Amino acid sequence: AESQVERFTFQAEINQLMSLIINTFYSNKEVFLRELISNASDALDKIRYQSLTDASVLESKTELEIKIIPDKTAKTLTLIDSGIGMTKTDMVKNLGTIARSGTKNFMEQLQSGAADISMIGQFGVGFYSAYLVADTVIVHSKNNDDEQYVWESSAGGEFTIALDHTEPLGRGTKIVLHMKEDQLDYLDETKIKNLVKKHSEFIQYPISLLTIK
Ligand SMILES: Nc1ncnc2c1ncn2[C@@H]1O[C@H](COP(=O)(O)OP(=O)(O)CP(=O)(O)O)[C@@H](O)[C@H]1O
Ligand SMILES: [Mg+2]
């Protein structure tokens, strides 16, 4: 097999944020689940609204749903949506190379005490909450306008993007969190089942919890 892999450097402030998220103790890291579900919901909304003005956008995948997959053997939590998806350029621009002023301000407020980790989503950097519980994050995504791509980072100032040769999504995003050893309790069946219930009260799309044994 062969793949071309492109390597990118994180914007300096995003690199600093990732370092802060990883190298500091946080008591309650539950916000990561809220943020991942929120992104899935937003993506489903986007394709849903696009369909109202152009019905054909749904032809790649008719269902609009979220699947959450804890896998203890693999030490992974996977969240799949059939939302809008991201092109390669979408992933480069949205997941590391561009920072908004929310990043600097969040780090300031974390240090001053004005903000805690649970408010990360108010600063426009909700995605990076994944690194509270994960050593490596892998983002597989398929947008109607591009081939399926896979973004991966274990922080440390770099991410990679490659044409995806794993299972076709049709359309949407599959995010795979490789869980830190001390955060593996997030993969416990009843714990994740109940947290999903807790962080999906206002979600208007079906959620399926698929526990891998
Ligand atoms: N499942 C998904 N499908 C499509 N795009 C996604 C996605 N998850 C993340 N993204 C993209 O990455 C960007 C960054 O996500 P992130 O959650 O950090 O910020 P956000 O724009 O959702 C505001 P917030 O900080 O409130 O969550 C999003 O704006 C979106 O474009
Ligand atoms: Mg978000």
Residue numbers in the entry: 2 to 214
From the paper:
Many of these proteins are oncogenic and necessary for tumorigenesis. (NTD), the middle domain and the C-terminal dimerization domain.
HspD-NTD in complex with ADP, AMPPCP, AMPPNP, ATPγS and geldanamycin. and ATPγS were disordered, it appeared only in AMPPCP. nucleotide, interacts with all the three ligands. interactions with all the three ligands. with geldanamycin, but does not show any interaction with AMPPCP. phosphate groups of the nucleotide, but shows no interaction with geldanamycin.
